[PDB]
PDB file of C-alpha atoms in Angstrom:
ATOM      1  CA  UNK A 122      16.575  66.562  59.688  1.00 46.70           C
ATOM      2  CA  UNK A 123      15.893  62.841  59.282  1.00 45.96           C
ATOM      3  CA  UNK A 124      12.370  62.871  60.729  1.00 47.46           C
ATOM      4  CA  UNK A 125      11.414  66.118  58.983  1.00 45.94           C
ATOM      5  CA  UNK A 126      12.722  64.782  55.654  1.00 45.37           C
ATOM      6  CA  UNK A 127      10.780  61.510  55.846  1.00 45.50           C
ATOM      7  CA  UNK A 128       8.792  61.033  52.614  1.00 48.69           C
ATOM      8  CA  UNK A 129       5.064  61.718  52.377  1.00 50.11           C
ATOM      9  CA  UNK A 130       2.541  60.801  49.704  1.00 48.77           C
ATOM     10  CA  UNK A 131       1.878  63.919  47.584  1.00 50.20           C
ATOM     11  CA  UNK A 132      -1.696  65.188  47.527  1.00 51.20           C
ATOM     12  CA  UNK A 133      -3.974  68.033  46.464  1.00 48.78           C
ATOM     13  CA  UNK A 134      -4.151  70.935  48.914  1.00 48.61           C
ATOM     14  CA  UNK A 135      -6.681  72.714  46.676  1.00 46.51           C
ATOM     15  CA  UNK A 136      -7.336  72.762  42.905  1.00 43.77           C
ATOM     16  CA  UNK A 137      -4.062  73.864  41.347  1.00 43.50           C
ATOM     17  CA  UNK A 138      -2.110  73.527  44.624  1.00 43.42           C
ATOM     18  CA  UNK A 139      -0.193  70.346  45.439  1.00 42.79           C
ATOM     19  CA  UNK A 140       1.943  69.323  48.404  1.00 44.18           C
ATOM     20  CA  UNK A 141       5.102  67.559  47.219  1.00 42.88           C
ATOM     21  CA  UNK A 142       7.386  68.156  50.200  1.00 41.56           C
ATOM     22  CA  UNK A 143       8.356  65.914  53.093  1.00 40.32           C
ATOM     23  CA  UNK A 144       6.836  65.218  56.506  1.00 40.34           C
ATOM     24  CA  UNK A 145       7.828  68.655  57.832  1.00 39.97           C
ATOM     25  CA  UNK A 146       9.759  70.360  54.987  1.00 40.14           C
ATOM     26  CA  UNK A 147       7.267  72.126  52.760  1.00 44.05           C
ATOM     27  CA  UNK A 148       7.374  72.052  48.974  1.00 47.27           C
ATOM     28  CA  UNK A 149       4.325  73.301  47.079  1.00 48.33           C
ATOM     29  CA  UNK A 150       3.624  72.811  43.378  1.00 49.02           C
ATOM     30  CA  UNK A 151       1.317  75.339  41.704  1.00 50.45           C
ATOM     31  CA  UNK A 152       0.059  74.020  38.375  1.00 49.91           C
ATOM     32  CA  UNK A 153      -1.345  75.981  35.434  1.00 49.83           C
ATOM     33  CA  UNK A 154      -1.809  75.258  31.698  1.00 47.96           C
ATOM     34  CA  UNK A 155       1.185  77.533  30.974  1.00 50.78           C
ATOM     35  CA  UNK A 156       3.570  75.792  33.382  1.00 48.52           C
ATOM     36  CA  UNK A 157       4.135  75.326  37.069  1.00 50.94           C
ATOM     37  CA  UNK A 158       5.609  77.075  40.106  1.00 52.64           C
ATOM     38  CA  UNK A 159       7.483  75.221  42.847  1.00 53.29           C
ATOM     39  CA  UNK A 160       7.940  76.893  46.241  1.00 54.76           C
ATOM     40  CA  UNK A 161      10.965  75.613  48.199  1.00 55.29           C
ATOM     41  CA  UNK A 162      12.782  72.329  47.691  1.00 52.80           C
ATOM     42  CA  UNK A 163      13.722  70.633  50.982  1.00 53.71           C
ATOM     43  CA  UNK A 164      17.194  69.236  51.506  1.00 50.08           C
ATOM     44  CA  UNK A 165      19.510  68.290  48.666  1.00 50.84           C
ATOM     45  CA  UNK A 166      18.757  64.695  49.690  1.00 48.28           C
ATOM     46  CA  UNK A 167      15.050  65.515  49.230  1.00 50.25           C
ATOM     47  CA  UNK A 168      15.295  66.561  45.567  1.00 50.84           C
ATOM     48  CA  UNK A 169      14.864  63.024  44.130  1.00 44.92           C
ATOM     49  CA  UNK A 170      11.794  62.363  46.274  1.00 41.60           C
ATOM     50  CA  UNK A 171      10.341  65.765  45.367  1.00 41.59           C
ATOM     51  CA  UNK A 172      10.840  65.048  41.665  1.00 38.63           C
ATOM     52  CA  UNK A 173       9.206  61.636  42.056  1.00 39.34           C
ATOM     53  CA  UNK A 174       6.309  63.235  43.954  1.00 42.04           C
ATOM     54  CA  UNK A 175       5.767  65.753  41.150  1.00 42.20           C
ATOM     55  CA  UNK A 176       5.808  62.961  38.562  1.00 43.23           C
ATOM     56  CA  UNK A 177       3.623  60.725  40.738  1.00 44.90           C
ATOM     57  CA  UNK A 178       0.938  63.437  40.615  1.00 44.98           C
ATOM     58  CA  UNK A 179       1.059  63.375  36.808  1.00 45.93           C
ATOM     59  CA  UNK A 180       3.254  66.406  36.060  1.00 48.20           C
ATOM     60  CA  UNK A 181       6.642  66.767  34.399  1.00 49.83           C
ATOM     61  CA  UNK A 182       9.694  68.680  35.574  1.00 48.93           C
ATOM     62  CA  UNK A 183      10.224  70.447  32.242  1.00 49.67           C
ATOM     63  CA  UNK A 184       6.936  72.320  32.736  1.00 47.83           C
ATOM     64  CA  UNK A 185       8.093  74.010  35.960  1.00 49.33           C
ATOM     65  CA  UNK A 186       8.876  77.593  34.959  1.00 45.73           C
ATOM     66  CA  UNK A 187       9.756  79.081  38.360  1.00 48.71           C
ATOM     67  CA  UNK A 188      11.295  77.844  41.598  1.00 49.37           C
ATOM     68  CA  UNK A 189      10.678  80.259  44.467  1.00 49.60           C
ATOM     69  CA  UNK A 190      12.580  80.208  47.758  1.00 44.07           C
ATOM     70  CA  UNK A 191      11.398  81.389  51.160  1.00 43.80           C
ATOM     71  CA  UNK A 192      14.813  81.603  52.829  1.00 42.41           C
ATOM     72  CA  UNK A 193      18.234  80.365  51.772  1.00 44.03           C
ATOM     73  CA  UNK A 194      19.002  77.621  54.264  1.00 41.32           C
ATOM     74  CA  UNK A 195      19.675  73.972  53.548  1.00 40.50           C
ATOM     75  CA  UNK A 196      16.181  72.699  54.458  1.00 37.97           C
ATOM     76  CA  UNK A 197      14.330  75.126  52.154  1.00 36.60           C
ATOM     77  CA  UNK A 198      16.839  75.858  49.369  1.00 31.87           C
ATOM     78  CA  UNK A 199      18.892  72.665  49.683  1.00 32.14           C
ATOM     79  CA  UNK A 200      17.205  70.848  46.816  1.00 31.57           C
ATOM     80  CA  UNK A 201      16.909  73.853  44.497  1.00 30.55           C
ATOM     81  CA  UNK A 202      20.170  73.221  42.618  1.00 33.67           C
ATOM     82  CA  UNK A 203      19.205  69.697  41.557  1.00 33.19           C
ATOM     83  CA  UNK A 204      15.546  70.479  40.873  1.00 34.71           C
ATOM     84  CA  UNK A 205      16.788  73.343  38.695  1.00 32.99           C
ATOM     85  CA  UNK A 206      19.143  71.042  36.775  1.00 32.50           C
ATOM     86  CA  UNK A 207      16.193  68.684  36.166  1.00 30.80           C
ATOM     87  CA  UNK A 208      13.518  71.245  35.207  1.00 29.25           C
ATOM     88  CA  UNK A 209      15.139  74.257  33.560  1.00 30.67           C
ATOM     89  CA  UNK A 210      13.080  76.496  35.832  1.00 31.63           C
ATOM     90  CA  UNK A 211      14.260  79.965  36.780  1.00 27.86           C
ATOM     91  CA  UNK A 212      14.841  80.554  40.486  1.00 27.35           C
ATOM     92  CA  UNK A 213      13.171  83.513  42.208  1.00 26.63           C
ATOM     93  CA  UNK A 214      14.424  84.890  45.519  1.00 27.63           C
ATOM     94  CA  UNK A 215      15.189  88.132  47.301  1.00 25.26           C
ATOM     95  CA  UNK A 216      18.600  89.707  46.778  1.00 27.29           C
ATOM     96  CA  UNK A 217      19.778  88.635  50.231  1.00 31.35           C
ATOM     97  CA  UNK A 218      18.682  85.028  49.658  1.00 29.74           C
ATOM     98  CA  UNK A 219      20.315  85.164  46.220  1.00 28.47           C
ATOM     99  CA  UNK A 220      23.662  86.086  47.783  1.00 27.98           C
ATOM    100  CA  UNK A 221      23.446  83.365  50.433  1.00 30.68           C
ATOM    101  CA  UNK A 222      22.308  80.832  47.832  1.00 31.36           C
ATOM    102  CA  UNK A 223      25.372  81.683  45.724  1.00 29.21           C
ATOM    103  CA  UNK A 224      27.654  80.864  48.672  1.00 28.45           C
ATOM    104  CA  UNK A 225      25.811  77.599  49.369  1.00 27.73           C
ATOM    105  CA  UNK A 226      24.320  78.869  52.620  1.00 28.85           C
ATOM    106  CA  UNK A 227      27.676  79.933  54.045  1.00 26.84           C
ATOM    107  CA  UNK A 228      28.286  83.282  55.752  1.00 29.16           C
ATOM    108  CA  UNK A 229      24.874  82.902  57.381  1.00 27.59           C
ATOM    109  CA  UNK A 230      24.562  85.854  59.758  1.00 25.42           C
ATOM    110  CA  UNK A 231      23.684  83.415  62.564  1.00 26.58           C
ATOM    111  CA  UNK A 232      25.081  80.032  61.485  1.00 28.33           C
ATOM    112  CA  UNK A 233      28.320  80.952  59.709  1.00 29.38           C
ATOM    113  CA  UNK A 234      29.442  78.003  57.589  1.00 27.21           C
ATOM    114  CA  UNK A 235      27.828  75.348  59.792  1.00 26.82           C
ATOM    115  CA  UNK A 236      25.140  74.126  57.362  1.00 26.57           C
ATOM    116  CA  UNK A 237      26.128  74.434  53.683  1.00 25.61           C
ATOM    117  CA  UNK A 238      24.236  73.158  50.653  1.00 26.84           C
ATOM    118  CA  UNK A 239      24.675  73.109  46.853  1.00 27.03           C
ATOM    119  CA  UNK A 240      25.049  76.669  45.522  1.00 27.65           C
ATOM    120  CA  UNK A 241      22.413  78.097  43.188  1.00 25.75           C
ATOM    121  CA  UNK A 242      22.355  81.177  40.979  1.00 24.23           C
ATOM    122  CA  UNK A 243      19.082  83.065  41.335  1.00 22.06           C
ATOM    123  CA  UNK A 244      17.702  84.089  37.947  1.00 24.84           C
ATOM    124  CA  UNK A 245      15.199  86.773  39.025  1.00 24.45           C
ATOM    125  CA  UNK A 246      15.878  88.776  42.174  1.00 20.42           C
ATOM    126  CA  UNK A 247      12.502  89.585  43.708  1.00 20.57           C
ATOM    127  CA  UNK A 248      11.531  93.019  44.978  1.00 18.53           C
ATOM    128  CA  UNK A 249       8.970  93.475  47.738  1.00 18.95           C
ATOM    129  CA  UNK A 250       5.551  93.242  46.106  1.00 20.38           C
ATOM    130  CA  UNK A 251       6.902  92.085  42.738  1.00 20.45           C
ATOM    131  CA  UNK A 252       4.427  89.936  40.820  1.00 23.64           C
ATOM    132  CA  UNK A 253       4.718  87.027  38.406  1.00 24.42           C
ATOM    133  CA  UNK A 254       1.734  86.047  36.258  1.00 24.94           C
ATOM    134  CA  UNK A 255       1.416  82.459  35.053  1.00 24.57           C
ATOM    135  CA  UNK A 256      -1.646  80.854  33.467  1.00 23.22           C
ATOM    136  CA  UNK A 257      -4.224  82.776  35.489  1.00 21.00           C
ATOM    137  CA  UNK A 258      -2.179  82.431  38.696  1.00 21.14           C
ATOM    138  CA  UNK A 259      -0.389  85.358  40.338  1.00 21.81           C
ATOM    139  CA  UNK A 260       2.715  84.974  42.506  1.00 22.36           C
ATOM    140  CA  UNK A 261       3.697  87.919  44.705  1.00 23.85           C
ATOM    141  CA  UNK A 262       6.753  88.426  46.890  1.00 24.65           C
ATOM    142  CA  UNK A 263       6.199  89.535  50.498  1.00 27.48           C
ATOM    143  CA  UNK A 264       9.473  90.547  52.129  1.00 29.64           C
ATOM    144  CA  UNK A 265       9.272  89.215  55.699  1.00 26.82           C
ATOM    145  CA  UNK A 266      12.837  89.523  57.030  1.00 28.01           C
ATOM    146  CA  UNK A 267      13.844  88.623  60.565  1.00 32.02           C
ATOM    147  CA  UNK A 268      14.630  84.918  60.482  1.00 28.91           C
ATOM    148  CA  UNK A 269      17.031  85.789  57.657  1.00 31.34           C
ATOM    149  CA  UNK A 270      17.816  89.180  56.098  1.00 29.91           C
ATOM    150  CA  UNK A 271      16.105  87.958  52.925  1.00 32.86           C
ATOM    151  CA  UNK A 272      13.308  85.864  54.403  1.00 34.05           C
ATOM    152  CA  UNK A 273      10.430  85.944  51.930  1.00 32.75           C
ATOM    153  CA  UNK A 274       6.790  84.963  52.202  1.00 31.21           C
ATOM    154  CA  UNK A 275       4.753  84.314  49.080  1.00 28.91           C
ATOM    155  CA  UNK A 276       1.198  85.339  48.229  1.00 32.91           C
ATOM    156  CA  UNK A 277      -0.535  83.323  45.513  1.00 30.75           C
ATOM    157  CA  UNK A 278      -3.804  84.403  43.919  1.00 27.52           C
ATOM    158  CA  UNK A 279      -5.243  81.243  42.402  1.00 29.28           C
ATOM    159  CA  UNK A 280      -7.198  80.840  39.178  1.00 27.03           C
ATOM    160  CA  UNK A 281     -10.407  80.526  41.230  1.00 27.17           C
ATOM    161  CA  UNK A 282      -9.797  83.716  43.230  1.00 25.94           C
ATOM    162  CA  UNK A 283      -8.706  82.103  46.494  1.00 25.91           C
ATOM    163  CA  UNK A 284      -5.679  83.685  48.163  1.00 29.11           C
ATOM    164  CA  UNK A 285      -2.774  81.559  49.389  1.00 30.30           C
ATOM    165  CA  UNK A 286       0.008  82.747  51.699  1.00 31.77           C
ATOM    166  CA  UNK A 287       3.197  80.704  52.024  1.00 31.91           C
ATOM    167  CA  UNK A 288       4.546  82.092  55.293  1.00 33.01           C
ATOM    168  CA  UNK A 289       8.275  81.981  55.918  1.00 35.44           C
ATOM    169  CA  UNK A 290       9.745  81.239  59.331  1.00 35.48           C
ATOM    170  CA  UNK A 291       9.679  83.908  62.039  1.00 33.68           C
ATOM    171  CA  UNK A 292      11.818  81.930  64.503  1.00 37.01           C
ATOM    172  CA  UNK A 293      14.973  83.187  66.199  1.00 34.69           C
ATOM    173  CA  UNK A 294      16.386  80.288  68.259  1.00 34.78           C
ATOM    174  CA  UNK A 295      19.716  81.188  69.808  1.00 37.29           C
ATOM    175  CA  UNK A 296      19.824  84.488  67.949  1.00 37.84           C
ATOM    176  CA  UNK A 297      21.665  87.433  69.511  1.00 40.51           C
ATOM    177  CA  UNK A 298      18.832  89.947  69.173  1.00 41.29           C
ATOM    178  CA  UNK A 299      20.372  93.012  70.852  1.00 40.60           C
ATOM    179  CA  UNK A 300      22.850  95.037  68.780  1.00 41.14           C
ATOM    180  CA  UNK A 301      23.448  92.071  66.484  1.00 39.94           C
ATOM    181  CA  UNK A 302      26.845  92.584  64.829  1.00 39.74           C
ATOM    182  CA  UNK A 303      25.948  90.850  61.562  1.00 40.07           C
ATOM    183  CA  UNK A 304      22.252  91.825  61.247  1.00 40.24           C
ATOM    184  CA  UNK A 305      21.781  95.195  62.967  1.00 39.03           C
ATOM    185  CA  UNK A 306      18.200  95.697  61.716  1.00 34.81           C
ATOM    186  CA  UNK A 307      16.972  92.288  62.928  1.00 35.60           C
ATOM    187  CA  UNK A 308      14.489  93.445  65.577  1.00 38.80           C
ATOM    188  CA  UNK A 309      13.072  96.217  63.388  1.00 38.89           C
ATOM    189  CA  UNK A 310      12.752  93.835  60.435  1.00 40.47           C
ATOM    190  CA  UNK A 311      10.952  91.036  62.264  1.00 44.63           C
ATOM    191  CA  UNK A 312       8.452  93.368  63.937  1.00 43.61           C
ATOM    192  CA  UNK A 313       7.563  94.939  60.589  1.00 45.99           C
ATOM    193  CA  UNK A 314       7.199  91.381  59.279  1.00 46.19           C
ATOM    194  CA  UNK A 315       4.713  90.570  62.056  1.00 46.52           C
ATOM    195  CA  UNK A 316       2.548  93.514  61.000  1.00 49.46           C
ATOM    196  CA  UNK A 317       2.972  92.703  57.303  1.00 47.76           C
ATOM    197  CA  UNK A 318       1.860  89.071  57.561  1.00 51.93           C
ATOM    198  CA  UNK A 319      -0.977  89.912  59.970  1.00 54.66           C
ATOM    199  CA  UNK A 320      -2.436  92.314  57.418  1.00 58.97           C
ATOM    200  CA  UNK A 321      -2.781  89.710  54.652  1.00 65.38           C
ATOM    201  CA  UNK A 322      -6.170  88.487  53.518  1.00 65.83           C
ATOM    202  CA  UNK A 323      -5.855  84.721  53.235  1.00 65.41           C
ATOM    203  CA  UNK A 324      -7.987  81.713  52.378  1.00 62.40           C
ATOM    204  CA  UNK A 325      -5.218  79.069  52.409  1.00 62.37           C
ATOM    205  CA  UNK A 326      -2.450  79.314  55.015  1.00 61.17           C
ATOM    206  CA  UNK A 327       0.748  77.353  54.343  1.00 64.98           C
ATOM    207  CA  UNK A 328       4.287  77.718  55.679  1.00 69.72           C
ATOM    208  CA  UNK A 329       7.838  76.519  55.164  1.00 66.99           C
ATOM    209  CA  UNK A 330       7.420  73.860  57.881  1.00 66.00           C
ATOM    210  CA  UNK A 331       4.380  71.607  58.137  1.00 64.01           C
ATOM    211  CA  UNK A 332       4.195  71.999  61.916  1.00 60.65           C
ATOM    212  CA  UNK A 333       3.507  75.724  61.512  1.00 63.02           C
ATOM    213  CA  UNK A 334       0.225  75.297  59.589  1.00 61.98           C
ATOM    214  CA  UNK A 335      -0.931  71.869  60.791  1.00 64.63           C
ATOM    215  CA  UNK A 336       0.020  69.940  57.652  1.00 64.16           C
ATOM    216  CA  UNK A 337      -0.418  66.489  59.178  1.00 67.52           C
ATOM    217  CA  UNK A 338      -3.877  67.040  60.674  1.00 68.37           C
ATOM    218  CA  UNK A 339      -5.283  68.859  57.639  1.00 66.12           C
ATOM    219  CA  UNK A 340      -3.827  66.176  55.357  1.00 64.70           C
ATOM    220  CA  UNK A 341      -5.604  63.450  57.332  1.00 65.63           C
ATOM    221  CA  UNK A 342      -8.908  65.339  57.282  1.00 65.35           C
ATOM    222  CA  UNK A 343      -8.784  66.080  53.548  1.00 61.70           C
ATOM    223  CA  UNK A 344      -8.035  62.406  52.912  1.00 59.67           C
ATOM    224  CA  UNK A 345     -11.177  61.557  54.908  1.00 58.63           C
ATOM    225  CA  UNK A 346     -13.405  63.839  52.802  1.00 56.42           C
ATOM    226  CA  UNK A 347     -12.938  67.372  54.201  1.00 56.85           C
ATOM    227  CA  UNK A 348     -12.244  69.156  50.922  1.00 61.44           C
ATOM    228  CA  UNK A 349     -11.843  72.491  52.757  1.00 61.01           C
ATOM    229  CA  UNK A 350      -9.258  71.160  55.229  1.00 63.08           C
ATOM    230  CA  UNK A 351      -6.672  73.738  54.121  1.00 62.46           C
ATOM    231  CA  UNK A 352      -9.067  76.697  54.108  1.00 62.72           C
ATOM    232  CA  UNK A 353      -7.648  78.332  57.261  1.00 62.22           C
ATOM    233  CA  UNK A 354      -8.446  82.049  57.363  1.00 62.54           C
ATOM    234  CA  UNK A 355      -7.340  82.563  60.991  1.00 58.58           C
ATOM    235  CA  UNK A 356      -4.220  80.381  60.826  1.00 57.40           C
ATOM    236  CA  UNK A 357      -1.805  83.057  59.634  1.00 59.43           C
ATOM    237  CA  UNK A 358      -2.836  85.549  62.323  1.00 62.89           C
ATOM    238  CA  UNK A 359      -2.407  82.816  64.938  1.00 62.71           C
ATOM    239  CA  UNK A 360       1.003  81.921  63.524  1.00 63.41           C
ATOM    240  CA  UNK A 361       2.118  85.564  63.720  1.00 62.66           C
ATOM    241  CA  UNK A 362       0.688  86.146  67.204  1.00 63.69           C
ATOM    242  CA  UNK A 363       2.498  83.097  68.591  1.00 66.47           C
ATOM    243  CA  UNK A 364       5.742  83.952  66.776  1.00 67.19           C
ATOM    244  CA  UNK A 365       5.530  87.512  68.093  1.00 69.45           C
ATOM    245  CA  UNK A 366       4.850  86.333  71.648  1.00 70.67           C
ATOM    246  CA  UNK A 367       7.849  83.996  71.491  1.00 71.83           C
ATOM    247  CA  UNK A 368      10.095  86.667  69.974  1.00 75.19           C
ATOM    248  CA  UNK A 369       9.234  89.345  72.542  1.00 73.78           C
ATOM    249  CA  UNK A 370       9.735  86.861  75.382  1.00 74.21           C
ATOM    250  CA  UNK A 371      13.201  85.993  74.073  1.00 70.72           C
ATOM    251  CA  UNK A 372      14.024  89.684  73.660  1.00 69.52           C
ATOM    252  CA  UNK A 373      12.834  90.546  77.173  1.00 70.15           C
ATOM    253  CA  UNK A 374      15.034  87.761  78.551  1.00 69.02           C
ATOM    254  CA  UNK A 375      18.102  88.981  76.655  1.00 70.82           C
ATOM    255  CA  UNK A 376      17.388  92.552  77.738  1.00 72.40           C
ATOM    256  CA  UNK A 377      17.261  91.336  81.350  1.00 68.65           C
ATOM    257  CA  UNK A 378      20.742  89.786  81.167  1.00 70.48           C
ATOM    258  CA  UNK A 379      23.372  91.451  83.412  1.00 71.22           C
TER     259      UNK A 379
END
């Protein structure tokens, strides 16, 4: 997690959308005249850098009204506790992420207690399709389980009409996929999530890890003048198609075991 947590200069993804995360751990600040929304928070060790990034852009922590979480593991929810204690924002997450966040990431269906992080109490438990309206911006929950029982993707309708999807992970490394004791609906959930994300209309494709939406390349191009570097209308469909191909290959292999 050292390389992924290396600091990066914050920058504008698009008017009202700012990248404040690390080299590969996404954290996105959505700014409005009525307050701000932060999506994900890196590691607990990332929280200070994320706060500094937000303040380096010219914004203050007190104005953040909502912290939203994709999935409750230490590299996406790890910094939420401290960013919450610095901003007074309310945390938004699915019920399943809320439970795992309360136990500090323990009792992970796949990881057990291996990778804990500071516990957080979710303030608003999101339902699939639930909306939050903030200064002309609209935040919508898209339940995309599979990677975790409560894995959540986020759709943002911006003040200018552009649509932004923050895609959660669809990865299953080392997962027991067949008759999984702790997550019996895993395969059914992740396939429905493939269809759900592939159906989204999208102007701006982001994700919980920079590698999944080409953060580094698009950042370089926008720095060099390409103002539309993060307009990526085919990126989400490509991300799903590749995730699906990888998932079904892993499942076929497990199904072929003696």
